[PDB]
Design a protein around this ligand. Structure first.
Ligand SMILES: Cc1cc2nc3c(=O)[nH]c(=O)nc-3n(C[C@H](O)[C@H](O)[C@H](O)COP(=O)(O)OP(=O)(O)OC[C@H]3O[C@@H](n4cnc5c(N)ncnc54)[C@H](O)[C@@H]3O)c2cc1C
Ligand SMILES: CC1(C)c2[nH]c3cc(Br)ccc3c2C[C@@]23CN4CCC[C@]4(C[C@@H]12)C(=O)N3
Length: 444
């Protein structure tokens, strides 16, 4: 008569999604997080329809109602050259037939955090989780507080949602593999809306944004730039993918030099117009984030089946991919659904089933994303004009964004159980079959 006791390590987007999914499906959750996750840091996150389909179920629609102001209203991507001439309008009608969100990461965290608290997730901030262990009966972690005190916490299993720099990862893969730099990085930030509104030279950027979010892309030699708005022009954000061979750390806090962006764009005709908006970025908010290529891990689940890596701890993707957060939300949904179908007496089975459902699909998205990091889509802009050939297509793939991970898990659960228990390979159909072999994905 006792609920499953889930421990969650890390309350980024994925840990919060896992906490909500598990709690809404009738499991007890104690989540731990080392930092004040409500602090304003980073820029905007996109959530595609594969993630919003999951979010819509939470609280009988309550979270979707809270996120309604952030539904993407762009009907097209406007693709421009280095003169700012519009070359192509790329239709988003299919991509946006179901909701997508774009919003500051800090606002998404706030909404999810408040819902988690409302539904009875137990949350402990200021806790660095250390030293996971497990056996056939249970798992435990050490909760280290800032006073140096150590508290043992026991549960049925541990969700390791501790991000790209996961220290839990070594409990599954003890040998760490460094990612390869792509040679590219992304300048990116939110624009200060207040100083933006006060600048007559930037007023053009507000045109139409109350009815359709801005989604402008500009291709210049050495730059892929996007300007976006969300929530009827309350928020503007931008990024610029550019060549960079410096030894940049993949964190969201390091100082970056705005004049590097100005130098890159000012030499092209459209540069001054782009800078009229971009210059309103606050100086300590200018981030230059390296686009690193991480290889799929061999597997995500520990030897006794009571620890699982999800989110960026398992499959980090660069922010240029568009599917990073959404794939992590799929992890949370598949894991919670698998746990609910397996039950408390079959925890290792639940985690291994979730891994077999998720691994190939997540790895395909990860491996494809290495292409946008390496600039495969760029051409010589002295000769070519940009068009749909140059837009990375992960956000446009129906096999990704149209997928219902919960329905797939319910329909396939017993077949995956059979594969796990008979020691056979499970061939998931939640990615195109030609993609496995083409990308070299090896099933777990
Ligand atoms: C500060 C920050 C800002 C970001 N801004 C953006 C952005 O603007 N755009 C974008 O596309 N992506 C951004 N990202 C990345 C994005 O959040 C992730 O790619 C994605 O949302 C899902 O990652 P995740 O939830 O698995 O991990 P993360 O979001 O990285 O969250 C991991 C969490 O685990 C916590 N943690 C780590 N180790 C421990 C431990 N031992 N004990 C307890 N807690 C621990 C961390 O404090 C963190 O809160 C940002 C990430 C961070 C950390
Ligand atoms: C993640 C991005 C920003 C994105 N985000 C979307 C959201 C929706 Br609803 C529809 C399409 C997209 C897309 C395609 C996008 C547009 N961007 C233009 C230069 C880099 C990049 C990243 C990538 C690209 O090549 N394709």
């Amino acid at each position: 008569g006792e609920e499953v006791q889930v421990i969650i390590v890390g309350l980024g987007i994925v840990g919060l999604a896992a906490a909500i999914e598990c709690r809404e499906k009738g499991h007890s959750v104690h989540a731990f997080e080392k930092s004040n996750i409500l602090k304003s840091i980073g820029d905007c996150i996109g959530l595609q329809s594969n993630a919003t389909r999951i979010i819509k179920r939470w609280g009988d629609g309550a979270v979707h109602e809270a996120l309604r102001p952030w539904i993407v209203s762009s009907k097209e991507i406007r693709i421009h050259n280095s003169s700012g001439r519009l070359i192509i309008r790329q239709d988003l009608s299919e991509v946006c037939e179901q909701p997508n969100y774009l919003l500051p990461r800090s606002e998404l965290i706030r909404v999810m955090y408040e819902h988690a608290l409302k539904i009875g997730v137990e949350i402990s901030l200021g806790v660095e989780v250390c030293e996971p262990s497990e056996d056939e009966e249970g798992a435990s972690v050490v909760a280290l507080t800032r006073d140096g005190e150590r508290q043992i916490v026991r549960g049925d299993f541990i969700i390791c949602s501790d991000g790209v720099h996961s220290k839990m990862r070594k409990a599954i893969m003890p040998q760490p593999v460094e990612p390869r730099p792509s040679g590219y990085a992304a300048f990116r930030a939110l624009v200060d809306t207040e100083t933006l509104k006060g600048d007559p030279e930037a007023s053009w950027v507000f045109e139409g944004v109350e009815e359709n979010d801005r989604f402008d892309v500009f291709f210049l030699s050495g730059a892929q730039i996007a300007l976006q708005s969300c929530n009827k022009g309350k928020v503007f954000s931008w990024f610029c993918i550019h060549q960079d061979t410096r030894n940049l750390l993949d964190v969201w806090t390091s100082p970056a030099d705005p004049n590097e962006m100005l130098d890159l764009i000012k030499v092209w005709p459209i540069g001054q117009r782009l800078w009229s908006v971009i210059r309103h970025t606050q100086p300590q908010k200018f981030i230059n984030y390296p686009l690193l290529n991480h290889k799929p891990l061999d597997h995500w689940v520990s030897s006794h089946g009571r620890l699982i890596l999800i989110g960026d701890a398992a499959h980090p993707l660069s922010p240029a991919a568009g599917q990073g957060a959404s794939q992590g939300i799929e992890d949370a949904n598949v894991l919670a659904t698998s746990l609910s179908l397996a039950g408390r007496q079959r925890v290792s089975l639940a985690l291994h089933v979730a891994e077999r459902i998720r691994y190939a699909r997540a790895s395909a998205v990860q491996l494809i994303s290495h292409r946008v990091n390496e600039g495969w889509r760029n051409q010589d802009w002295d000769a070519y004009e940009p068009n749909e050939q140059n837009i990375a297509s992960l956000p446009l793939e129906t096999w990704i964004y149209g997928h219902d991970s919960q329905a797939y898990t319910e329909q396939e659960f017993e077949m995956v159980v059979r594969a796990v228990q008979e020691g056979e390979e499970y061939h998931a159909t939640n990615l195109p079959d030609k993609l496995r072999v083409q990308l070299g994905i090896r099933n777990v």
